[PDB]
Amino acid sequence: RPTFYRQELNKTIWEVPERYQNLSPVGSVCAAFDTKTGLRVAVKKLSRPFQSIIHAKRTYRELRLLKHMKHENVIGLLDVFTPARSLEEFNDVYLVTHLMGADLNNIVKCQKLTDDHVQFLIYQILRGLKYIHSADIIHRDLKPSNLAVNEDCELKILDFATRWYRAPEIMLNWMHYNQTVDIWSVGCIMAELLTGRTLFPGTDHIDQLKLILRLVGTPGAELLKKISSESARNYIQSLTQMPKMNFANVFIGANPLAVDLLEKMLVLDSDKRITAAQALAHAYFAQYHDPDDEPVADPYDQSFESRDLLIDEWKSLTYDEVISFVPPP
Ligand SMILES: Cc1ccc(NC(=O)c2ccc(CN3CCN(C)CC3)cc2)cc1Nc1nccc(-c2cccnc2)n1
Numbered sequence: 001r002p003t004f005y006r007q008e009l010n011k012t013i014w015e016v017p018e019r020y021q022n023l024s025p026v027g028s029v030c031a032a033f034d035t036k037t038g039l040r041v042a043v044k045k046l047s048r049p050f051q052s053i054i055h056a057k058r059t060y061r062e063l064r065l066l067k068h069m070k071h072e073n074v075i076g077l078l079d080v081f082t083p084a085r086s087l088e089e090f091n092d093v094y095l096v097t098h099l100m101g102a103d104l105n106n107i108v109k110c111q112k113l114t115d116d117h118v119q120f121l122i123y124q125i126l127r128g129l130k131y132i133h134s135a136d137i138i139h140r141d142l143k144p145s146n147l148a149v150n151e152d153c154e155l156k157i158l159d160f161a162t163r164w165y166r167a168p169e170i171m172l173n174w175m176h177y178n179q180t181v182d183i184w185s186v187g188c189i190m191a192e193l194l195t196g197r198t199l200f201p202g203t204d205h206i207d208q209l210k211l212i213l214r215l216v217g218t219p220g221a222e223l224l225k226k227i228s229s230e231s232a233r234n235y236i237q238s239l240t241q242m243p244k245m246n247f248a249n250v251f252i253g254a255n256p257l258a259v260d261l262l263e264k265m266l267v268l269d270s271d272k273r274i275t276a277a278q279a280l281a282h283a284y285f286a287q288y289h290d291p292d293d294e295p296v297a298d299p300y301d302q303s304f305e306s307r308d309l310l311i312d313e314w315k316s317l318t319y320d321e322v323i324s325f326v327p328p329p
């Protein structure tokens with residue numbers, strides 16, 4: 001067991017192994033210098049991990065999730081620790097990842113992208129997503145500030161305005177969503193990268209749905225067939241502004257294939273939305289698409305998700321996960 005040390009930061013007690021030095025708060029996440037490796041790291045101290053049942057499950061969910069992600073386009077776990085010598089002391093959890101230089105927002109402000117940047121950047125997201133999706137994990141909150149990019153235009157997916165990127169079925173509250181909610185988002189992100197501006201800058205969610213509907217159009221028979229509620233079906237029709245544009249005239253100076261890919265991602269009907277795996281093979285990624293370098297996830301046991309347990313059991317589960325962690329090489 002390493003030796004620990006205490007520090008008060010922006011009115012909060014951080015205690016970490018001395019391995020991590022020079023903590024400085026970026027937002028409760030500090031940047032720190034991992035002296036084992038000389039690399040800058042990010043340290044998250046989970047707020048009130050075991051305060052309620054809901055908190056306890058999320059603590060656990062995030063640990064499991066971080067312990068599973070092992071792909072170059074997705075954030076991974078360097079370290080997890082607790083200053084606690086035992087289960088009974090266990091009340092803090094800290095997670096460690098690579099520190100990130102920039103997110104997609106920063107890249108946006110700082111340089112105007114080549115077509116070739118947009119291809120390489122979206123390619124990485126999709127390759128990340130084919131790996132998340134293959135584990136039956138749905139991101140749900142893809143947006144530029146959750147995409148980290150280094151100096152070589154390499155990208156990692158993480159999770160820390162969200163709605164600009166949300167699939168419309170989420171904003172119309174179905175209890176059941178599939179993985180292609182994440183593809184809606186990728187298309188919102190791509191569009192932004194090519195156009196320089198936000199595709200649906202909605203003041204509120206109904207504003208969002210309106211902008212969506214005038215660009216992609218009102219749903220086909222085939223999709224109206226799948227909506228059970230008359231109220232829903234009426235409400236949707238109730239938009240209802242100046243018609244399905246052109247789409248292609250919103251992106252006029254862009255690469256014809258980019259625009260084609262975007263047409264297959266920004267499909268109202270999530271049954272018809274292109275998947276990450278299919279999107280990988282779309283001609284717009286001809287420069288990067290390598291079929292033998294696009295791996296899928298190991299089996300991932302999320303039977304815990306359906307489970308309703310006591311704080312202490314969630315706290316115990318989380319403790320086993322902490323104790324059994326194996327650092328990467
Ligand atoms: C230190 C840490 C601990 C945990 C996480 N967690 C995650 O990144 C994550 C990734 C994917 C998911 C996927 N997921 C599936 C289900 N749902 C609903 C969404 C979540 C969730 C959390 C990130 C980090 N890293 C992190 N977080 C925020 C900011 C920074 C950071 C800040 C500044 C400079 N460099 C890095 N670094």
Ligand SMILES: CCCCCCCCO[C@@H]1O[C@H](CO)[C@@H](O)[C@H](O)[C@H]1O
Nearest residue numbers: 168169176177178226268269270271
């Ligand atoms: C206002 C524009 C939004 C129209 C409704 C979005 C259509 C979303 O698509 C729907 O996704 C569901 C969610 O899992 C699936 O069950 C349905 O099969 C699919 O058609």
